[PDB]
Design a binder for this molecule. Structure first.
Ligand SMILES: CC(C)c1nc(CN(C)C(=O)N[C@@H](C(=O)N[C@@H](CC[C@H](Cc2ccccc2)NC(=O)OCc2cccnc2)Cc2ccccc2)C(C)C)cs1
Ligand code: HEM
Length: 457
């Protein structure tokens, strides 16, 4: 079992029994990957408990697994712990289950729908500005994540469901309260450490109704969507929620609820985390913040409201987003379960091996980015933009299994950026941690919440 990579002549760190190389994650897995690539070259192997994982860095080899051989050999991700009814969520579904969900849902995020989401989010822009404006009157430091989370919460419920929930006016509110508790994939937590290591356990927890998602959070989330469904049943916009009732003429009751959670989570978690990273970056590189404010002000003269089209006009904003995602790619790795023995670009890979693309590492590889640790948007300009491999920069993954809400995360993040910047400026203070330190566990977050001060323009 543990001799796989030795017998295939692939480098790697030497693994202990039972544990695999799991202990090397103590320094966080993004750093572990760094060390590895650096130590072992272009390809290397390790063991997550008894699980072989092959890291891969060749840009072609990557396009092969992500784009060409996806449907036939690398279709799935790693199965991960007790999930229960959430076993049908799109991000977790496999093979045949997945293809349908992927096409049943993909039509949620087309131009027409995206354009149609603008004016609803336009309402939640103001409430954000107006909210932050009060902190600019109180004049004491701000938890970006808090207030961006609220914004995030507001926009996902209202678009994917058509049901306003007024989160921003609620410093206290059950929706966010529960959605943040939904999954902390933390190794300090013996639980995740132990399932991840000893997976022979997972089927047992599945019979005992235990789940990685607290029974609590999921109870409140099932009931909410249970209800949001029957709200619509009362009235007489084809959206996420709609599209799925329309399928109820093959997507079942619980199936319908499970997509919502994924969406809700994605919508809430990702969006707010990234926006906090960017505002940190802007406020620690003031030149860029002014540059961005000028661009915005030039495209949206005298605080004029952002629209679908103006947003895509904003080239620097895009450079700013892209560079922050380079530095902080919130999925730190991409992964695909190899389901049949196969040979990709001069390499055999046996059935069952998890193939793994260390995004965080590839993003910081001093072999593809001059001064890779530094925040430099100009690397994303038209001028320098073509010199950038689409299989090295993978913040939304790639191929058929790539991020389904990319275009919606982006439009939405920018919408919020614009509206903030065209009213406020942001500055470091005494509790603002410099430079930033990622936390060690599953999620890519800062170990201390993002706090900045806000001046009113
Ligand atoms: C110790 C070793 C095995 C580990 N490696 C990792 C890193 N890793 C593979 C992860 O991505 N972590 C976890 C994870 O969040 N990914 C899985 C888990 C499904 C999880 C569903 C979920 C999550 C939280 C709460 C409720 C439901 N993912 C999910 O739906 O993601 C929403 C999302 C996130 C980012 C961008 N777009 C969408 C799927 C996924 C991963 C990356 C991007 C998109 C989907 C699981 C593997 C447990 C964690 S533990
Ligand atoms: C900036 C915010 C976001 C980042 C950085 C991001 C990143 C990703 C990445 C890298 C993947 C994996 C691609 C792959 O595995 O090849 C992913 C998967 C996915 N994302 Fe996004 N995402 C973001 C926002 C969203 C939003 C807003 C939604 C939905 C509303 C979303 C829904 C999904 C789903 C459902 C999957 C699994 C796709 C599948 O297996 O078919 N994520 N996310």
């Amino acid at each position: 079992s543990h001799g796989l990579f030795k017998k295939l002549g692939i480098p790697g760190p030497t693994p202990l029994p039972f544990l695999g190389n799991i202990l090397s994650y103590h320094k966080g897995f993004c750093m572990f990957d760094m060390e590895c690539h650096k130590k072992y070259g272009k390809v290397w192997g390790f063991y997550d408990g008894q699980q072989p994982v092959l890291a891969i860095t060749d840009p072609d080899m990557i396009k092969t697994v992500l784009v060409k051989e996806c449907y036939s050999v690398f279709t799935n991700r790693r199965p991960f712990g007790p999930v229960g009814f959430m076993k049908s969520a799109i991000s977790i579904a496999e093979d045949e289950e997945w293809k349908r969900l992927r096409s049943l849902l993909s039509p949620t995020f087309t131009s027409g729908k995206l354009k149609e989401m603008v004016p609803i989010i336009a309402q939640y822009g103001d409430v954000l500005v107006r909210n932050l404006r009060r902190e600019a009157e109180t004049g004491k430091p701000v938890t970006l994540k808090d207030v961006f989370g609220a914004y995030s919460m507001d926009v996902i419920t209202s678009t994917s469901f058509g049901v306003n929930i007024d989160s921003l006016n609620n410093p206290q509110d059950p929706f966010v309260e529960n959605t943040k508790k939904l999954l902390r994939f933390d190794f300090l937590d013996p639980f995740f450490l132990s399932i991840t290591v000893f997976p022979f356990l997972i089927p047992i927890l599945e019979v005992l109704n235990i789940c990685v998602f607290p029974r609590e959070v999921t109870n409140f989330l099932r009931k909410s969507v249970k209800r949001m469904k029957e709200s619509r049943l009362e009235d007489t916009r084809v959206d996420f929620l709609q599209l799925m009732i329309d399928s109820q003429n093959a997507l079942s009751d619980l199936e319908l609820v499970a997509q919502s959670i994924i969406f809700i989570f994605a919508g809430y978690e990702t969006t707010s985390s990234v926006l906090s990273f960017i505002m940190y970056e802007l406020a620690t590189h003031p030149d860029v913040q002014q540059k961005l404010q000028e661009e915005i002000d030039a495209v949206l003269p005298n605080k004029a409201p952002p629209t679908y089209d103006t947003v895509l006009q904003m080239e620097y904003l895009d450079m700013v987003v892209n560079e922050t995602l380079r530095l902080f790619p919130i999925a730190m790795r991409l992964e695909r379960v190899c389901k049949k023995d196969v040979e990709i670009n001069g390499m055999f890979i046996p059935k069952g091996v998890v193939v793994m693309i260390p995004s965080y590492a590839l993003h910081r590889d001093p072999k593809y980015w001059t001064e890779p640790e530094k925040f430099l948007p100009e690397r994303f300009s038209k001028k320098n933009k073509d010199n950038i491999d689409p299989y090295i920069y993978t913040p939304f993954g790639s191929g058929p299994r790539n991020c389904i809400g990319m275009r919606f995360a982006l439009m939405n993040m920018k919408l919020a950026l614009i509206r903030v910047l065209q009213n406020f400026s942001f500055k470091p203070c005494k509790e603002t941690q410099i430079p930033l330190k990622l936390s060690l566990g599953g999620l890519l977050q800062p170990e201390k919440p993002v706090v900045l001060k806000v001046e009113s323009r």
